[PDB]
Design an enzyme around this catalytic site. Structure first.
Site, PDB file in Angstrom:
ATOM      1  CD  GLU A 143      -2.880  -1.213   2.304  1.00 39.25           C
ATOM      2  OE1 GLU A 143      -2.790  -0.404   3.274  1.00 39.25           O
ATOM      3  OE2 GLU A 143      -3.630  -2.388   2.436  1.00 39.25           O
ATOM      4  CD  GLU A 251      -3.973  -8.457   1.678  1.00 42.42           C
ATOM      5  OE1 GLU A 251      -2.969  -7.830   1.838  1.00 42.42           O
ATOM      6  OE2 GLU A 251      -5.070  -7.695   2.357  1.00 42.42           O
TER       7      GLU A 251
END
Length: 340
Positions: A143, A251
């Site tokens: 991220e 994910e």
């Protein structure tokens, strides 16, 4: 006797799931053993877990997950070496214990830049040397993109102190300590969004041009029963494949609530909601199967609705993002992809 999830995708790609050390025994453990052939630590391998305070590493939880995987012939993914979240604040404190981001003196800032990069190098070397032999897929940075921040780079302490240097060093350090066999990834969420997708694309392209060893892109794919369009998910994957990069769904989970919804179905949960979830999952996997040559693995962020961050974030409520319910029984979404 129901079919094995991973077995259903034998001819496409391995199917993985995030896990906690406590789920390596008991009934939940048997669910993992029957349905997945790949694992990733939900929390045990983040910076906060491995080096809570400087020089004091904690390996027990991570080691337990590694052992469980090896005992059952499951592949492993490492989540994650660098991330603005779940990283002890000591990493970013200067020699006096004050936040490096607060330093105004140019020379001290230069000293702090080198100090932080040294800490990063030493952290990565210790972790990689320990697990390089058993873990072949690595989420090196996580991220690092944020469209709302200047230049599209997440303005975290890592960035404020080192710019993009921490990313370049992270990949280099992992490659040097780990060898040419392990695969390195840059992981992120909302990689389907055009704006964020292109920002990430430009960064990776520039880094590759500079010789940074990046093998692929991790698409968290934390989506919901309404958004985003499967076409956007695939468009992003194909775009990165154009740079010679591998793609991994890292994910995957599907919230039963839209972005702006803060209601709670509670015990219940309407039938149409679970059926809609199944249709969405089927549509997604039909598309992923058509892109198996550019998607090396599909990993779910869990396996049972009994254990999911979505039951607490953004609020505490009854979500149902996965393929097995709270009693470890197959949901409509399970049948929709193993027997559509």
């Amino acid at each position: 006797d129901i079919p094995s999830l991973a077995e259903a995708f034998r001819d496409y790609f391995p199917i993985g799931a995030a896990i906690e050390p406590g789920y390596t025994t008991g009934q939940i453990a048997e669910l993992y053993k029957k349905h997945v052939n790949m694992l990733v630590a939900e929390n045990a391998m983040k910076p906060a877990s491995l080096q809570p305070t400087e020089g004091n590493f904690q390996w027990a939880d991570a080691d337990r997950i590694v052992q469980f995987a090896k005992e059952n012939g499951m592949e492993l993914r490492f989540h994650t070496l660098v991330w603005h979240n779940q990283t002890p604040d000591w990493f970013f404190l200067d020699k006096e214990g004050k936040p490096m981001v607060e330093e105004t003196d140019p020379q001290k800032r230069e000293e702090n830049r080198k100090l932080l990069l040294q800490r990063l190098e030493n952290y990565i070397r210790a972790v990689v040397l320990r697990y390089k032999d058993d873990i072949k897929s690595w989420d090196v940075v996580n991220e690092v993109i944020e469209p709302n921040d200047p230049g599209g780079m997440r303005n975290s302490p890592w960035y404020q102190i080192t710019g993009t240097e921490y990313i370049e060093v992270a990949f280099r350090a992992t490659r040097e300590a780990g060898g040419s066999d392990i695969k390195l990834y840059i992981n992120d969420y909302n990689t389907d969004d055009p704006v964020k997708r292109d920002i990430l694309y430009e960064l990776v392209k520039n880094l590759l041009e500079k010789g940074v060893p990046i093998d692929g892109v991790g698409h968290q794919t934390h989506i919901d029963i309404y958004n985003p369009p499967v076409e956007r998910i695939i468009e992003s994957i194909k775009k990165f494949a154009g740079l010679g990069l591998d793609n991994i769904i890292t994910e995957l989970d599907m919230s039963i609530y839209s972005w702006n919804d803060r209601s709670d179905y509670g015990d219940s949960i309407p039938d149409y909601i679970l059926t809609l979830q199944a249709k969405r999952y089927q549509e997604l996997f039909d598309a992923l199967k058509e892109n198996k040559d550019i998607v090396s693995a599909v990993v779910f962020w869990g396996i049972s609705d009994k254990y999911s961050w979505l039951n607490g974030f953004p609020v505490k409520r009854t979500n149902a993002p996965l393929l097995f319910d709270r009693n470890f029984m197959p949901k409509p979404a399970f049948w929709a992809i193993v027997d559509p």
